[PDB]
Design a protein around this ligand. Sequence first.
Ligand SMILES: [Mn+2]
Ligand SMILES: [Mn+2]
Ligand SMILES: [Mn+2]
Ligand SMILES: [Mn+2]
Lengths: 198, 198, 198, 198
Amino acid sequence: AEYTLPDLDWDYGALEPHISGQINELHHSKHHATYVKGANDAVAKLEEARAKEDHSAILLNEKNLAFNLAGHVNHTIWWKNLSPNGGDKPTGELAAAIADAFGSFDKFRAQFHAAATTVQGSGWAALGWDTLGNKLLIFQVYDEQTNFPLGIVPLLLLDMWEHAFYLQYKNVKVDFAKAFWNVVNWADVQSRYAAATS
Amino acid sequence: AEYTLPDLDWDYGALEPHISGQINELHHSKHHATYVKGANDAVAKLEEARAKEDHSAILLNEKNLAFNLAGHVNHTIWWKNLSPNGGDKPTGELAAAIADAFGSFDKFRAQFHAAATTVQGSGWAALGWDTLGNKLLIFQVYDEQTNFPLGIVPLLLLDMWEHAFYLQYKNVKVDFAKAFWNVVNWADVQSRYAAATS
Amino acid sequence: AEYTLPDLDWDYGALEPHISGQINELHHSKHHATYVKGANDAVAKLEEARAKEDHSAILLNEKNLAFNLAGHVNHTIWWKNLSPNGGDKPTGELAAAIADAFGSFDKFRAQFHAAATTVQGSGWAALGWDTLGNKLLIFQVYDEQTNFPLGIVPLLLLDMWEHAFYLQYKNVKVDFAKAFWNVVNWADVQSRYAAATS
Amino acid sequence: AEYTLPDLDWDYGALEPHISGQINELHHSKHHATYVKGANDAVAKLEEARAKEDHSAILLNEKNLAFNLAGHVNHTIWWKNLSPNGGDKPTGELAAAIADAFGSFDKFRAQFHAAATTVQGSGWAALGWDTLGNKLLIFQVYDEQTNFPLGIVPLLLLDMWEHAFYLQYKNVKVDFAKAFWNVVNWADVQSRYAAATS
Ligand SMILES: [Mn+2]
Ligand SMILES: [Mn+2]
Ligand SMILES: [Mn+2]
Ligand SMILES: [Mn+2]
């Protein structure tokens, strides 16, 4: 079927004072809403190019399909990886994978904060699992669909676009990145990590 | 463990006259082994950047880790996707999936040849499975790592970087992506389809 | 010598009510001065890689000098393409060139508003003169240095990164872009087209 | 007027043995003519999109104009910076410029060969002059149009695309880039630098 906007499982002002309800609102409502309309739209123009047998604008069509489909895919996962009752540290299988992988929790976290505040332009920090070589790696994604390999399973994303922190942190991106840690919903990530390794 | 170079399950000349045994051996033995060696070396300086706690070149190691891991993941699925004994059409569930998603294998095929031949630079054509929307969509990747959403599971790719056809097709890439079709191991696509929707 | 921050020919409050005074003071004071600092550091590090003969981080020093010199080149010409007493329409020579190059001032204005509001990530709309075909064309810039040819001389630029409008027009990109037209200082655009075509 | 494929000031084989005549010929006559047709067609779809007042596909028309116009300005300067009677060193002002900006002609050259051999995908190395701070600097361009600032004057470039050397050096691009130094035509570079500094 068509893609659609998921609802949040918290009220827009729930991450205050770490992330304002003004931002969650424009973000879920303006920003993600337009990526889901863009995704359904690129889907429908390729169905028509498929019937008129005219692949003359293939390049804008495959570029509009990857851009909206990926902004909706990262957005969808960023709402479930944040929680009002979040913070602290991961536990169980996940916390042991993370120290085995980056040596230690605080080390994984100095690299994740280093990959998210050095993007030149918009992009995000993403923790993913590579099934080719079964490892847990951190990637710096540019924009919404570039800089990582195909088939990588996404587990915890930090949105670096300016719309995610300009109305409250203005240009101090590092303090928005420090505040994200107090709202991480580690239960969602742990659950992502287990279906990833099954 | 370490990423390593897979062996093909055919002799390099096996694919002739569709793809000359000299490209199969410069592609596999030279281009792929360099991605496998660049992916183990980007995993190793992130390891030492974590130990000295020096994240000053984090933009370079995250960039060297996606380019080479993407080049290694995409050549490893191109060698299984190609076989001396393939060609023809998909069968079963995979062939009804295609027909149902693109209308017919013939319309699936003309869109895949448009996206593989209209790339501006190095890139490939990719048939993948989207888990969010449960759809079989094609994408146009630029280089090895860009232009598709995280988590898409790849099932059929066609390498259009110059090195996969210059020696025998010179500048005529269209001719190569038409030959391609005669050596597709649809049993390998069939198998990846079945596991992506398991 | 070293690169430095240009002063403005007007007080941050001067383009009110079209672009706020906070936005220009953060833009100039925070954003632009960082770029000016990072191009002087990309310069210093290549001098240092050249003295010790080690160019193992070339990909990186080549990307940071282009990201930061681009950004400082783009912002230094944005403070000049604007003005309290600006607005209206181009006069003289530039006018005719405009009307000749794009059919009309109103049709140049519609081609530049659409390339400005359709960028997928950060970017700007820029009017430039091509000295090889001696044509005035409008390009869509990705980030601060992508998507135009080497050697284009830049004449009027519209900053579309979110931080240039966020705090005041929120995700309403479209109203920052039309309000722009009432503060463009056409005298500075006419003098740079005159020197580029001398 | 329209853009057109310039004439080489030499015959295809005059570069032997440093770069084969078969490359120079499919390079000029197939790759370069394709970007000139493409630049020509992109400028016309904008004329046609500006008269029917329909900017639906502005992203593809501005991307097809920067891609193909950038490849035509790059190849047009590549046939002139190469020559059968070149090689050796720069002389005069160019050379004291080059040694005071990169330490010595031997250090500018190790830096340029570094930037042309680690590109990740298609690309070129180019030395250009920055008008803002008046300095010679080398850049690593991605594709034909990304990675440098607007307004930099190009002076010398080395095409790292595969099609520039795969048929004679195969994957050994560090060799192709070593042989280039015997074909550089320094009277051209030094003449583009005296006009750039005027
Ligand atoms: Mn976002
Ligand atoms: Mn390849
Ligand atoms: Mn800006
Ligand atoms: Mn070329």
